[PDB]
Amino acid sequence: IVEGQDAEVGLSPWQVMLFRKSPQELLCGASLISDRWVLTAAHCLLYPPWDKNFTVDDLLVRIGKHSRTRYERKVEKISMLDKIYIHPRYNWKENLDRDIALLKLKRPIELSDYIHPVCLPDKQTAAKLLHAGFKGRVTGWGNRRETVQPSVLQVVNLPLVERPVCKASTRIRITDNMFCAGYKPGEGKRGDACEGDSGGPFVMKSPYNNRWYQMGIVSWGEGCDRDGKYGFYTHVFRLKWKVI
């Protein structure tokens, strides 16, 4: 999370962190969307370009944490997956299209004041909210900048950007299953998720019902806080895939 800020305790209840079990290793971010379903990006589990094909037995999840190292004893809740679901039409050799995966936990996590499900968007909310200029929120423990491992969960609010602008800033084929956000060269403000932040949530707060809806999943990008480049996120709504 480049240019982020230390998250207040309990800021993102849905925050989940993907870990390679042995050796311990923070692989990616992810979000809790029910007491037994986690939402994350496919490339955190399957990305042949860097020979990566994770099974359930190779993954383990930790929920309710704050620091990236220490164990949150009266707060944290470690749980193992029981099955993985990667979108059938996920495009890894081209433009990371449909970069989405569901992780079914083995034992339903028990909610607390530090662990609570994020809401999936509905047409109304998705329609009234997904508008250029409106800033969403990204959280994560990724690189403090590009080659960097944050102590406390970082947070940063980012403004959504117009599709044309997004498409123009990259040779890569942008598809309707992804949007992009970040400040423009000149607004005099910075920030951006970064590798490692991957699989994390890009959420937006609805003033109708005062609740947090998840709008995108940190997917790809070129660099981290590069000028004139914006991060892309899987478009959760266009993907609301049925597996549950």
């Binding site: 800020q5 207040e8 305790v9 309990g10 800021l11 993102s12 209840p13 969307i33 607390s112 004041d113 530090y114 609570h116 499900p117 994020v118 809401c119 200029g133 409106f134 800033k135 929120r137 947070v155 609010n157 403004p159 937006m204 707060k205 609805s206 003033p207 019902n209 005062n210 609740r211 947090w212 809806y213």
Partner: peptide
């Protein structure tokens, strides 16, 4: 869902929330 127990529930705003509505 989406009603964080230590903020929404307690009826309290977090540091950066202002920005969100402000940008709206």
């Amino acid at each position: 869902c989406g009603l964080r127990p230590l903020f929404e529930k307690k009826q309290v705003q977090d540091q950066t929330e202002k920005e969100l509505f402000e940008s709206y």
